[PDB]
Design a protein around this nucleic acid. Structure first.
Ligand code: SAM
Ligand code: MG
Ligand code: MG
Ligand code: MG
Ligand code: MG
Ligand code: MG
Ligand code: MG
Ligand code: MG
Ligand code: MG
Ligand code: MG
Ligand code: MG
Ligand code: MG
Ligand code: MG
Ligand code: MG
Length: 81
RNA sequence: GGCUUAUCAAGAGAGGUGGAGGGACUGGCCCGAUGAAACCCGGCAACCACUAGUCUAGCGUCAGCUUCGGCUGACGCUAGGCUAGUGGUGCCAAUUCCUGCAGCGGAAACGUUGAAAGAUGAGCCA
């Protein structure tokens, strides 16, 4: 649901900075795009699942970025709340 | 900050940190969360100073040679070029990424001349 993202108050964009947000429990939910390189995605589904944080999935990384205000596409987005 | 001048069609880490924009302006078109700027490391390059080493020439002192005018050698100095380090910069996607004023070749794509406007160094002025 790109809506949940386009509606979220605060959020982090991109894999690196998200994994970093997961590493401090500030994250409420995590959205990751299927079409993105798996080596990059599974990186977050693991840290996410292992922590017991909900993980949602969206078809495109180019639409995900659009939902964040970025103009280039994001592999994953953390929702800080 | 400005003026003068030189250069700008090559080269340079799938890097660390970092977090949202960058490519001067211009109209584009590129680059960016698969990570922009900045900082650091690393590299390219050789513009300024210095340090050597190297080559060249004139010159000198000694030394051989002399087909006797003159060559050759070491060494020293002066001068210059090259390379290698220091220190100072600069630079590390797309020709100065393309257009910006005026032309050139070509059938077009494309290539290209000079400016304009920038960028960097050096020397002055602030
Ligand atoms: C295009 S500009 C800038 C070049 C840039 N610094 C480079 O290394 O690619 C060319 C001028 O930069 C100056 N410059 C300063 N540092 C330089 C360097 N390391 N290598 C070449 N040029 C340099 C020179 O005066 C030269 O004429
Ligand atoms: Mg100023
Ligand atoms: Mg000016
Ligand atoms: Mg030219
Ligand atoms: Mg980088
Ligand atoms: Mg911040
Ligand atoms: Mg990074
Ligand atoms: Mg050499
Ligand atoms: Mg680099
Ligand atoms: Mg024209
Ligand atoms: Mg013509
Ligand atoms: Mg056309
Ligand atoms: Mg043209
Ligand atoms: Mg000019």
């Amino acid at each position: 649901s790109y809506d949940k993202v386009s509606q979220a108050k605060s959020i982090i964009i991109g894999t690196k900075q998200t994994v970093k947000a997961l590493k401090r429990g500030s994250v409420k939910e995590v959205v990751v795009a299927k079409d993105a390189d798996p080596i990059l995605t599974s990186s977050v589904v693991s840290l996410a699942e292992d922590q017991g944080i909900s993980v949602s999935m969206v078809e495109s990384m180019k639409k995900l970025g659009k939902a964040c205000g970025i103009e280039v596409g994001a592999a994953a987005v953390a929702i800080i709340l």
